[PDB]
Design an enzyme around this catalytic site. Structure first.
Site, PDB file in Angstrom:
ATOM      1  CB  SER D  28      -0.795   0.151   0.955  1.00 15.83           C
ATOM      2  OG  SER D  28       0.141   0.070   2.279  1.00 15.83           O
ATOM      3  CD  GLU D 181      -0.260 -13.333   3.328  1.00 16.42           C
ATOM      4  OE1 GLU D 181      -0.357 -12.554   2.582  1.00 16.42           O
ATOM      5  OE2 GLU D 181       1.013 -12.667   4.165  1.00 16.42           O
ATOM      6  CE  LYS D 223       2.804 -14.276   0.859  1.00 11.97           C
ATOM      7  NZ  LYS D 223       2.901 -12.866   0.387  1.00 11.97           N
ATOM      8  N   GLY D 266       8.150 -13.002   6.059  1.00 11.55           N
ATOM      9  CA  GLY D 266       8.268 -12.562   7.548  1.00 11.55           C
ATOM     10  C   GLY D 266       9.143 -12.424   8.599  1.00 11.55           C
ATOM     11  N   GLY D 267      10.712 -11.417   7.789  1.00  8.67           N
ATOM     12  CA  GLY D 267      10.995 -10.426   8.367  1.00  8.67           C
ATOM     13  C   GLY D 267      12.905 -11.169   7.952  1.00  8.67           C
TER      14      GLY D 267
END
Lengths: 338, 338, 338, 338
Positions: D28, D181, D223, D266-267
């Site tokens: 976004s 997800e 996901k 995720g990081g």
């Protein structure tokens, strides 16, 4: 069956009669052993028969006791003097009831959380117990509060609700009013507000399951814990608090087609058990009768009086009557303290 | 316990071995009575012992049969010649299994939909059966399809799933691999597509419940119906159709940690039962072993051959071997028809 | 928050006040178009403003109407004479309420069963509506009975309950009392007993979900259908029957912490809507206030009187008052018929 | 519809193609602001257009990337040089996908646990996005692990599953393959085994809900998070461990009709994200394709290279290609490290 539904509803209302409640006298052999111990009585059949006769032959008891929950032995027992236990109850107009669960077993892979066993052969047992004079049944489930361990777990709550709903439907198919007992133990040092939250969660699950199994609430009774602090707490919650949170937890979860809520006393003193019920019934009137289904809280003084000594009989029956009167008055919100 | 988990998973994989499957020989006294009837044999213990010995002493059987489900009597039985039934199985390297349910009971206020009973004392029975040589267990639940009557109802499905999950967890706590059998009966004239929809719905509920009860899928097996038209239908669905819808229904619902799906034959002919399994295994390879746990479909010809006549023994064991070979080959997708 | 809980409970009790109930005036543009049609009025803003002012400016209306449900346009509207609609309500002491759902959408792969949409931005809308003078909200879900098609399906019921619980919790976080409306449509020719069974099933699911989402029942209201025969039935059920089955369905499912049950009239005549409520309140007293949240059943005669003709205003407001009085008296079980 | 089912399944398989996976480029405005910050780029439309064009115009990208998830702006955007973003993707044979959720909102009365919003107008948006060239959709839900706080709570899990199932069914009714997800955040210092337990519980609930809403698994993708220690842990779990627990958690819960599991990173570092996927695919073959849907783990080096400086374009696209190749090879279990 309109006929079976009518009978169940009539009998449930008779058990939840104003000014009356239940004597829970359904201690198993091993549970009664313990009691007989405290006063150094040896657990012979003959003694169990003497003690149960001492309870049930108490003159005028039926003024305050609508129903007595028996253990199977007692249902088929005779008093020492040879009268069937059921006929003693019938002479006082007390409805015989029967404990029908087979006790507790650990749920695999929980931290010692318990299933209640007993569905196998239940239907057939109910039929026999009805022929023997029982008109209501009892099944006890147990849950623990331990926030650190996430107790009661989902599995605990869902199992308790499944067994209670199956049992209740089976009872009703056999003309027995089921007492639904999901006891949340007082174990631990949680506050009354935590008990309240857990009680509401458990009762919501129980009543959804009762609905799912087509149980007739008009022909059933509930036997829940009162809402209290945990038993590792230093001071008990006040009577006003216990009454506040207990009535609220019920009003939040229990449909009012249920005719009675007959509390278990769960380790409370005889006096607290009466006062806490009385406090709820000052707050009346209610959507359902709030009354009692007490074991120790009706019996403890009676036992400590009788002492295993026969000679102490009249004194012990007088003592039973004092506590029955107290709790009958408490049902009406008219108990003045003792 | 890593140790218990390891044992269960190893044993489940051994049962779901390539080219092999299960002989379901766990007919109760009353179920076996019927079979002995068709060939006019009288149901003495001695005959049941003769027939079970005829099955289990079949030379080379263990080439095709990884495991045999027994009824309790048989688990503790001796062959006529005096050898324990379990020792016959052990000599062929066939793993003994035990039916542990107590059969069916109507759910109150349903249209004769069935609960499976048997949890009470299950844990203790499992312990005894393990000591007796059992390494896997079986529990059968039954559901009906009747779209006009909304069968299977929510209560039916939720009860079947609850009992199967409780049973499976209890087995696993006692070192027994549970076979989870939710049989959707063929009763009625619904199409294969309706069977498929209902099978998927039931299996989704079963596997969610198995997860909720902490059942180890690596140490379990499933015994479902194949997906077929109802038995009131004039022509059976084609082998290709049955294989299509059956494999799809499984792939849609069953996690692949489950090591085997061992179909029940549910009234199919011996030949259809083999061909339908074979068709699924042409479509291989799969996420899980698709194999068989057959009773009648392994035994019917064997029984009709033996005839209660001892003299017919060798012929009947040869016939059992033909069908065991056929289904072993079908597991591999290599059965050519018979 | 004790403060928010207190406000919600106080406001819910004020809405469920004895002798009073709700005017449902929350017709969307397209819904109001239809009404304006029947009397040949054209649907200009100015007319909608005239009609809503005609309702809300009715002198003495607040004797019988505790609350008015508005459509968003109306909440931010001025009467033709320039007074804000909310200020008209405030002068009669009627609490403004706001419809907050975004209407219905088909659930994929159902037979045209409906989800209610509206959660996105709900929290923020609630905040704005509260600032605008709303103190309660409404969200309508719809279910159909069709036993042949298994309607209402599990998916239907679970969706309705999910949306109602989410919406109710969001309202309460924003200081709005939620009206929970799960309307079971009268469509079809099922008997009153079928409606009863379905209503009980739906309400059990709704209240379990409300509990799961932590909705405060003391600060909520229910707007259910009455229990009736389907609308394709030739004769309506008697008032006595409708009252019997409706009160029973509620007592079987609704916890008594809920302060009010404000029925929708669902196609009933103005007179039936009053008589059916009155019959329930002869059967009093109850665990919760049984009252009304009526649209057509308050408005139909009023509209047919006003006729789009301004000149007919006083007559139409008198007619509105007759029906408001009738339903206020019916709340008390004191309506004598009209 | 066989036709819609066929299209969805074909498209899902094309996205889960061997040796390929997804570029998640659906940041976004506010999310992309952050990235543009790290390299001191100002967030003009023109820059977002430059960066997205830099990604999507990368020559040969479609060798490794089957699909690209876009933000709505980008779906309707033109590159600086004037080519529609969708046409860039189409020239590389990359399938355009669209994020369709409206982001997160707190669930009332939880400890800041999140609902995902976006169902309102979803169906209509899906229709428009399909006309615009999208063939798959994405909806992200988030859960936290906090054992002390009982996170993720039942309400958290049930909400996540409800929204994902509704969204997936709505997508499929509109010819879009849904990516489901449910991300369990790494927040906290729990061990990999705790992540595993929670992941399995969440996935079991998600797939039961997908079944309840009639979602076609053959036309969907998952996901999920990989299974790892929490991010407050000092050393990451080994690649072997992460692969062990991740594949096991999937095999325990995911039916194999699902064609692909496209992990979120995720990081994780770019290198860990590749190595951890590669380790899972040494353990092959699997019941479903295990691949990637990476944002930062594909983009981080690319961004740090481009630097907002146009001149750095070719270098940044080369860097994107190195990481795409690495993860394509990792899908095949053939990545040698970088």
């Amino acid at each position: 069956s309109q006929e079976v539904a009518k009978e169940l509803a009539e009998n449930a209302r008779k058990i939840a009669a104003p000014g009356k409640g239940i004597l829970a006298a359904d201690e198993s052999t091993g549970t009664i052993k313990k009691r007989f111990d405290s006063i150094g009585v040896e657990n012979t059949e003959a003694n169990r028969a003497f003690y149960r006769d001492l309870l049930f032959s108490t003159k005028g008891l039926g003024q305050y006791i609508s129903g007595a929950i028996l253990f199977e032995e007692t249902l088929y027992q005779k008093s020492p003097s040879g009268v069937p236990m059921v006929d003693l109850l019938k002479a006082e107009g007390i409805i015989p009831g029967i404990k029908v669960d087979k006790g507790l077993e650990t749920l695999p892979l929980t931290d010692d959380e318990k299933a209640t066993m007993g569905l196998d052969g239940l239907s057939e047992r109910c039929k026999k117990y009805y022929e023997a004079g029982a008109r209501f049944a009892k099944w006890r489930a147990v849950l623990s509060i331990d926030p650190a361990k996430g107790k009661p777990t989902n599995l605990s709550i869902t199992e308790v609700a499944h067994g209670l709903a199956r049992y209740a439907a089976i009872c009703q198919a056999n003309r027995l009013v089921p007492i639904v007992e999901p006891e949340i133990l007082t174990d631990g040092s949680h506050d009354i507000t935590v008990c309240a939250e857990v009680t509401e969660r458990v009762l919501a699950a129980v009543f959804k399951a009762l609905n799912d199994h087509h149980v007739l609430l008009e022909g059933a009774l509930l036997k829940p814990n009162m809402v209290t602090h945990g038993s590792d707490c230093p001071k008990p919650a006040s009577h006003e608090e216990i009454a506040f949170y207990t009535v609220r937890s019920l009003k939040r979860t229990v449909p009012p087609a249920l005719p009675g809520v007959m509390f278990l006393s769960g380790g409370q003193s005889e006096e607290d058990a009466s006062l806490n019920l009385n406090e709820m019934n000052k707050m009346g009137p209610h959507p359902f009768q709030l009354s009692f289904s007490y074991g120790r809280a009706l019996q403890a003084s009676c036992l400590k009086a009788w002492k295993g000594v026969p000679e102490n009989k009249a004194k012990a029956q007088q003592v039973l009557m004092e506590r029955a009167r107290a709790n009958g008055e408490a049902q009406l919100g008219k108990y003045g303290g003792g």
